[PDB]
Nucleic acid binder design. Sequence first.
RNA 1: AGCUUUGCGCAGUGGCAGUAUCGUAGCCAAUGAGGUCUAUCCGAGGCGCGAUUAUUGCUAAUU
Lengths: 124, 198, 376, 48, 74, 50
Amino acid sequence: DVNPKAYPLADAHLTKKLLDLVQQSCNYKQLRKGANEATKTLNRGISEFIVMAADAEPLEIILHLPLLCEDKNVPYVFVRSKQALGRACGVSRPVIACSVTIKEGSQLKQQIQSIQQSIERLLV
Amino acid sequence: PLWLLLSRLEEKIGQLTRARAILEKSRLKNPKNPGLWLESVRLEYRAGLKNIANTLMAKALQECPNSGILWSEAIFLEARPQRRTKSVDALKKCEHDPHVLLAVAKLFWSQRKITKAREWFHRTVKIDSDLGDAWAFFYKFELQHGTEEQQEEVRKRCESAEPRHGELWCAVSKDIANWQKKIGDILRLVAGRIKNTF
Amino acid sequence: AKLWDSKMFAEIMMKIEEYISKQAKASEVAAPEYRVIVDANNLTVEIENELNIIHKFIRDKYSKRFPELESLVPNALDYIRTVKELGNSLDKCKNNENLQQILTNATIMVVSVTASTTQGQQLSEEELERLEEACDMALELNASKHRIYEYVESRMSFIAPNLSIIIGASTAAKIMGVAGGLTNLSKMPACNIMLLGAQRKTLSGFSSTSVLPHTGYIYHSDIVQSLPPDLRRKAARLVAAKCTLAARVDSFHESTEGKVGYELKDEIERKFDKWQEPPPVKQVKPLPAPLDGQRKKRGGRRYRKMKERLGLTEIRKQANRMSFGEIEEDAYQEDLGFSLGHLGKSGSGRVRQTQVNEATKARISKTLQRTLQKQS
Amino acid sequence: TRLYLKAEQERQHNYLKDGPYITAEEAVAVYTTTVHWLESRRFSPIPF
Amino acid sequence: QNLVTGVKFEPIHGNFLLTGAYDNTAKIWTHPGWSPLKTLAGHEGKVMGLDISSDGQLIATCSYDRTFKLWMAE
Amino acid sequence: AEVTEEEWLSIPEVGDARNKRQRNPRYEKLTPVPDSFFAKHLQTGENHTS
RNA sequence: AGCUUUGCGCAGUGGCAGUAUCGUAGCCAAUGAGGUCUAUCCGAGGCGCGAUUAUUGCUAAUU
């Protein structure tokens, strides 16, 4: 199965919703790909939420992101596939961490808030 | 001002956890207020809980993102290589109130960019606003800096502005404690305002 | 008042924790050793934040004597050693003294030339004594920092076993100390890690390429420096990315054997070999055989535009005509025989001058236009 | 061209390895002479 | 108004009911009547758990805010 | 003589390092100078009357 | 019930440039391509090879 270290793992419905929102954010120029860009967004406090994969090997290369999310008060979730997450980001290469940035006046704000509420009530 | 002063008393009392509870209740009763957030962040920072203070500052900046004081303390809450300039760039986009310009001038003076620090101090004083500890910081910097005639010029400009009305003096009391009884007659009258600020 | 007062407390704490570190080193060769490493790595940050304050104080104090040396020597330690060596007497033969070890020869001649026209007054004896006291304190702090780095480098096989494999313990020690901790190192993007330890070295009448910019400890690591200089930037980027991965693994104390580190090092070596791979055999293209058969070419808008561009123009049609027996006058010294022909000359048959054809106007390439747009 | 450029590569490599060939004292003398001349002529530096 | 995690009665008798949720708040309900009495408003993160002391006048509520709080009548 | 037969076989082939553009560049077209050159040359000969 | 945002198609009209457009069971690439400027900052394809009238078809002439 999946690594137990990724405890806030989303189910199929939330996985589909998260991938759809990630694709929409990519279309709106509101997404950052890669763990390094996710870390940069977290340090600058311009991240709505962080989506990271559960197939990263080793998973410890992105387990620092939950700590930064807790420090910066940003929701985070784990998806079951690093290949579908990359495809949602618009990149054929697998992506193990994507960050949805904050853009004032964006039409995705309501969907972003709904996804944040869904994620923040799923970790435990 | 009643909330933060009571919290400061509780900090002085030695029961810092009661101060934390009081500040939390104040923030609950007064949501999205930079003034309570600033004191809440300073409470953990002054208690040595730098990680907790940084987390509280991130939470504070999530709300009220245009707060100048929050960003001004945020950059100096960061290490000098660890995005002390990057957060300055991030906040300068957010707003341009004097608390920003004072913080940027202080950072430039910290790196001994004396010309740039002086220019940003002038922008903070002349352009941004005519209140706060801006004149005190400029005077301290020019005392540290090599300017001698300009050192008295800054004092003359500070005396020219900041009159007995108390608008600038009350804002100066945020860092110069001009609301104290001793300062009530040093350069102004206590009977005029004074008690409005903290 | 404050920095001087806090200096004694910092020195006392550093001495106590250095005695603790020496005791730990003796014991190695319930007070666990990991807490000792954490204390030493926080000591590194404290020493850095005291050394920069001392350097700022010296810079402010020494600016009265030789104000320009700060720009010539941006490095804090080099600044302190230089102001110690020169002191109040700038022209005291110190140029050929230990300065050659402190500074590069080019910047040595630059600082000597600048000191030739210092326009700065001498410093008082109290100012002197304070300056040498600050310099000695800074040198002692640097020595303590070197001792702490040596101790941490001696224990890098346990705290960061994976990252040790890639760049070695020395570079690991340097990056861990400058980052502020293994945890701080992990919570940092690979781009920032590559610039760890970078110095804004002054360029003295040279291009910014000669004085390697945006290069840190990783760029000067053994594996990165072993490549030809034309591939060292990509090597530094790749090694920094893999070191960031290893640090993230190490901060969670996983793969303590070093399996992740060995895999990352093998990947780095494979990529380096691929960059060093000899070029493949490439076929020679023979000359096309001459052809005399008719070839049908399409027309249309594109053909019309190419015909308009390459086609003969009235200004060029008239410049190709030379009058018979009308001996003109030379109009270009640098090239004889050159003439405008019938352009603006009698016998052309045209009263009015021919206008410039705008279809022959000079234009830049699409890729060149893209580069110009990017430059803006 | 090949021979001259090989010689030039050798010369530049030697300059980089042996450092500047003008000692500080000679550089100080030349710079001081230039500064004194410019001050005597009251030359105003060309601005940006 | 968010995912409810901690539900606990008064340890001595059915004096009241204490509830905690991901709404970063806690509420008190009369055990017989199930009507609200006092909303333990506060915290800044999701209230993961809670407990009431055997004495019954002590209420502790840990949260995602990295802090735990105590409640006594004043 | 001591070069083993395996060493003799293992001699690599020589590959060109120049890319496609260097080895086989596209034909470089030659174009006439713009008419502005003739215009400026004929304007050079013009002179003021004062 | 209208209005409107984003992406994807399908067409219509119009403008611009042919020193450029494609091909990739070749290689590398968000586990970071590539970095002259802004570098504790930037973030996406790059390279090699191949095709060619610097995309390719018909049609009309001469043949």
